[PDB]
Enzyme design. Structure first.
Site, mmCIF file in Angstrom:
data_model
loop_
_atom_site.group_PDB
_atom_site.id
_atom_site.type_symbol
_atom_site.label_atom_id
_atom_site.label_comp_id
_atom_site.label_asym_id
_atom_site.label_seq_id
_atom_site.Cartn_x
_atom_site.Cartn_y
_atom_site.Cartn_z
ATOM 1 N N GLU A 156 -11.289 -1.086 -3.016
ATOM 2 C CA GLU A 156 -10.659 -0.575 -1.782
ATOM 3 C C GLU A 156 -9.295 0.152 -2.447
ATOM 4 O O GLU A 156 -9.405 0.429 -3.589
ATOM 5 C CB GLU A 156 -10.000 -1.705 -0.917
ATOM 6 C CG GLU A 156 -9.300 -2.577 -1.432
ATOM 7 C CD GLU A 156 -8.828 -3.778 -0.756
ATOM 8 O OE1 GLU A 156 -7.826 -4.445 -1.066
ATOM 9 O OE2 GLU A 156 -9.553 -3.730 0.406
ATOM 10 N N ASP A 204 0.833 -1.403 -0.261
ATOM 11 C CA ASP A 204 -0.198 0.084 0.037
ATOM 12 C C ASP A 204 0.727 1.454 -0.049
ATOM 13 O O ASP A 204 0.734 2.115 0.892
ATOM 14 C CB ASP A 204 -0.741 0.050 1.139
ATOM 15 C CG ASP A 204 -1.685 -1.266 1.544
ATOM 16 O OD1 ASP A 204 -2.233 -1.985 0.249
ATOM 17 O OD2 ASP A 204 -1.491 -1.840 2.735
#
Ligand code: AHR
Ligand code: AHR
Ligand code: MG
Length: 468
Positions: free
Chosen positions: A338, A162
């Protein structure tokens, strides 16, 4: 030459001297505790062999004794020299890194165990990682040196998922990412993307030992808003690691790597549920929050929402769903949207998101709005019907996603930073396979002004941008 010795499996930690105690630590203070002089070996100055000298106590070296490590002054004995001489060999867990083989016990290597330094035989994969180090020296990319050319070697940062990269107005990129233990918030900075590889990271925040903010710590993003630093991140509780909500840290100090970070609490949305992966952007005087959240009435793990913000610490009004899983490529493993990320270009606002499970099936989709539209009207947003970035077997890259967008230092080209694995098959729960690595490549532009992300580039040196 002056070097830092960084752990392969704890890459935020460095071999350091702690009042003669030899250990690995993060946040090494003063930094000179982690600096060593690699010199020709005391027992053999010839090829391979080095001795590891303190920069503070010259004449003091790392030496093994009863297989433990001590920082001690050279007493001129042959036993000292042999105990303080090590052959630098290709890394036992990765031959591009470094391991340190004992001169007088050539089957034994320097390794860390319970964060202390030892000289051990190396048998297991754990042993091999404990015995592998990255040497950061004067030839390494200097994170404080500016350069307009963007040339990276992918993976830029191993075992960080991420990746969030923010180009600040001080001439530094700032990077936050998920760490494999999901237990803390890590920050680093560099004037160049490649320098993110060698920059010394700082643990700016660790999770609580129980209760709130005490579960999984996921996907922090650092932002500069109204003169202050903010970190938006997602955190569960100690009794349910997956009962995840959005939280905020604030730092008024100008340097976020030295300043004081304060917890501000939960960033609340319209209802309480699984909520994660928040980002923010500004447009035409309005700031927005964009994030992922479970709706109890929709059979997806999370959908993408946008809302207007009322300062950096809250949303206002109603949150609007602008993406929910619809196509099969969003639902492999489980249905999920997401990791939203915003890119403004060519009179449009682009939001990529990630979908499907976090294994090789992970991929990215794209939402597009006109930058003159009402961004809180769902009909302003158009989802592309196919993935816009996905695994590529011919380049050996699998499950790419949860990206961020930044630019070259001169702002002229857009660069995507994202994670992927360089193998396909995962053993066990993919959440606990730690080998998603951070990497970067250029964003191209189609003639119609929309982004062309291409395919994930193969590992190795990537020339992203050379200015004209
Ligand atoms: O650390 C192993 C050995 O133990 C000590 O006796 C010696 O100095 C060293 O070579
Ligand atoms: O030294 C840190 C860790 O402690 C021990 O559990 C392991 O051998 C090592 O990885
Ligand atoms: Mg993010």
């Amino acid at each position: 030459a002056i070097a830092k010795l960084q752990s392969y499996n704890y890459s935020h930690m460095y071999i350091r001297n702690a009042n003669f105690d030899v250990r690995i630590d993060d946040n090494v203070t003063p930094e000179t505790d982690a600096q060593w002089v690699l010199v020709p070996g005391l027992a053999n100055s010839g090829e391979g062999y080095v001795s590891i000298q303190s920069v503070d106590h010259l004449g003091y070296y790392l030496r093994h004794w009863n297989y433990d490590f001590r920082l001690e002054k050279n007493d001129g004995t042959r036993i000292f020299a042999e105990d303080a001489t090590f052959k630098m060999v290709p890394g036992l867990a990765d031959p591009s890194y470094t391991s340190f083989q004992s001169y007088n016990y050539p089957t034994r290597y320097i390794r860390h165990y319970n964060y202390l330094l030892r000289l051990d035989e190396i048998v297991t994969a754990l042993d091999r990682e404990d015995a592998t180090f990255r040497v950061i020296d004067s030839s390494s990319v200097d994170p404080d040196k500016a350069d307009d050319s963007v040339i990276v070697t992918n993976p830029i940062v191993r075992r960080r998922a991420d990746p969030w990269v923010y180009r600040h107005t001080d001439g530094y990129y700032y990077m936050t990412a998920s760490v494999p233990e999901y237990d803390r918030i890590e920050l680093r900075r560099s004037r160049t993307l490649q320098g993110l590889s060698t920059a010394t990271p700082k643990t700016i925040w660790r999770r609580h030992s129980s209760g709130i903010m005490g579960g999984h710590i996921w996907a922090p993003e650092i932002h500069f808003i109204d003169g202050k630093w903010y970190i938006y991140f997602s955190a569960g509780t100690s009794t349910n690691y997956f009962d995840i909500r959005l939280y905020v840290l604030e730092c008024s100090d100008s340097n976020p790597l030295t300043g004081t970070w304060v917890e501000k609490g939960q960033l609340k949305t319209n209802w309480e549920s699984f909520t994660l992966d928040a980002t923010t952007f500004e447009h035409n005087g309005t700031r927005y929050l964009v994030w992922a959240q479970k709706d109890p009435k929709i059979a997806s793990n999370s959908n993408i929402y946008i809302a207007k913000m009322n300062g950096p610490l809250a949303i206002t009004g109603n949150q609007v769903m602008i993406s929910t899983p619809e196509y099969s490529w969003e639902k492999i493993g489980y249905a999920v949207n997401e990791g939203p990320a915003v890119l403004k270009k060519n009179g449009k606002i682009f939001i990529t998101f990630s979908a499907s499970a976090t294994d090789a099936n992970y991929c990215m989709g794209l939402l597009t709005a006109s930058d003159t539209a009402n961004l809180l009207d769902p009909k302003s947003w158009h989802k592309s019907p196919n993935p816009v970035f996905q695994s590529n077997p011919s380049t050996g890259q699998y499950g790419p996603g949860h990206n961020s967008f930044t630019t070259s230092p001169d702002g002229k080209v857009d660069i995507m930073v994202y994670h992927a694995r360089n193998y396909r098959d995962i053993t066990g729960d993919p959440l606990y396979d730690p080998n998603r690595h951070t990497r970067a490549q250029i964003v191209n532009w189609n003639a119609d002004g929309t982004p062309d992300f291409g395919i994930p580039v193969a590992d190795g040196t990537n020339v992203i941008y050379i200015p004209p």
